[PDB]
Write an enzyme that holds these catalytic residues in place. Structure first.
Site, PDB file in Angstrom:
ATOM      1  N   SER A  51       0.690  -1.250   0.492  1.00 60.13           N
ATOM      2  CA  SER A  51      -0.135  -0.299   0.017  1.00 60.13           C
ATOM      3  C   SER A  51       0.938   0.964   0.053  1.00 60.13           C
ATOM      4  CB  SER A  51      -0.686   0.054   1.120  1.00 60.13           C
ATOM      5  OG  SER A  51      -1.921  -0.891   1.323  1.00 60.13           O
TER       6      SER A  51
ATOM      7  N   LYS B 220       0.707   3.176  -3.259  1.00 59.06           N
ATOM      8  CA  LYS B 220      -0.789   4.543  -3.235  1.00 59.06           C
ATOM      9  C   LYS B 220      -0.459   5.905  -3.364  1.00 59.06           C
ATOM     10  CE  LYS B 220      -3.988   1.418  -0.673  1.00 59.06           C
ATOM     11  NZ  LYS B 220      -3.811   0.639  -0.602  1.00 59.06           N
TER      12      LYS B 220
ATOM     13  N   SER C 147      -6.618   2.573   3.552  1.00 61.29           N
ATOM     14  CA  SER C 147      -5.410   1.682   2.393  1.00 61.29           C
ATOM     15  C   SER C 147      -6.853   0.997   1.911  1.00 61.29           C
ATOM     16  CB  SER C 147      -4.570   1.631   3.448  1.00 61.29           C
ATOM     17  OG  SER C 147      -3.545   0.112   2.139  1.00 61.29           O
TER      18      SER C 147
ATOM     19  N   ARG D 262       4.789  -0.402  13.115  1.00 65.98           N
ATOM     20  CA  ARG D 262       5.631  -0.315  12.348  1.00 65.98           C
ATOM     21  C   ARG D 262       5.938   1.590  12.528  1.00 65.98           C
ATOM     22  NH1 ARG D 262       1.353  -1.224   7.464  1.00 65.98           N
ATOM     23  NH2 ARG D 262      -0.457  -0.221   9.457  1.00 65.98           N
TER      24      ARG D 262
END
Ligand SMILES: Cc1ccccc1-c1cccc(C(=O)O)c1
Length: 242
Positions: free
Chosen positions: A47, A50, A95, A227
């Site tokens: 993602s 994107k 997302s 993350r």
């Protein structure tokens, strides 16, 4: 120009994980990482793709602006937030893969391949299905290559309009307070080994910008919050954010 600090590995190993963080000091033009090798290893963007996908859709007119509504197709998916209407802002925030799959179909193979080459994006290879190549196709990008792409976006130097770049940077807005602004995008790649999570973007300060790109092993979705958490802890350690 580049400095390796292997002691930062503790940020990952203390969570029974492994990964890389890459930082770039724009004022000083210096980079920092815990692992030079993994910093240059190429993974599926998932993602994080994107970001370029949005830029291409906007510049081609596939997406009119950040208010255009992409209606839910009525197909119940396992991610609750995907089962609703979205615009570019909420599609980025949550997302929303199926919205971006439709972007890619309307972009088409030829224009997508050509724009990725213009962006110098990763290995620029869209081999696979046009509506899923960033999830299980041939495209790959390294953490250092993410930094290079984001620096161009920050400076409006990508080969799309200024407007398209301003809109995507608006849609990347993640956090803002009196101390800093973070524009970033998460990624989660599971279809091809090794499974990883991404976080890429930058931190805006009053007098400097710090670009960052991290990926980490992600055998289970239980670790996705690491993350951002690990990245911000590295930023705090380096006195980039309080
Ligand atoms: C694809 C996916 C599979 C399993 C669990 C979560 C997710 C997911 C879905 C949407 C957003 C996110 C996220 O990180 O922001 C993660």
């Amino acid at each position: 120009e580049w400095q390796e600090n292997k002691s930062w590995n503790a940020h990952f190993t203390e969570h029974k994980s492994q990964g890389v963080v890459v930082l770039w000091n724009e004022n000083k033009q210096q980079g920092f990482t815990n692992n030079l090798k993994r910093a240059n290893q190429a993974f599926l963007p998932a993602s994080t793709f994107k970001i370029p996908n949005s830029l291409i859709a906007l510049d081609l007119g596939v997406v009119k602006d950040e208010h255009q509504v992409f209606k839910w197709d009525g197909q119940t998916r396992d991610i609750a937030t995907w089962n609703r209407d979205h615009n570019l802002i909420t599609a980025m925030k949550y997302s929303v893969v199926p919205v971006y799959q439709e972007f890619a179909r309307q972009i088409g193979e030829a224009r997508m391949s050509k724009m990725l080459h213009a962006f110098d994006y990763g290995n620029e290879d869209i081999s696979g299905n046009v509506d899923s190549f960033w999830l299980d196709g041939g495209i790959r990008i390294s953490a250092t290559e993410q930094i290079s792409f984001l620096r161009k976006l920050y400076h409006n130097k990508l080969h799309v309009s200024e407007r398209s770049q301003r809109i995507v940077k608006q849609a990347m807005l993640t956090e803002a307070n009196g101390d800093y602004i973070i524009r970033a995008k998460t990624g989660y790649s599971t279809r091809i080994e090794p499974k990883i999570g991404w976080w890429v973007g930058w931190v805006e300060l009053d007098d400097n910008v710090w670009f960052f790109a991290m990926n980490m092993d992600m055998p289970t979705s239980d670790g996705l919050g690491l993350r951002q958490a690990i990245t911000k802890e590295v930023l705090k350690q380096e006195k980039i954010i309080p």
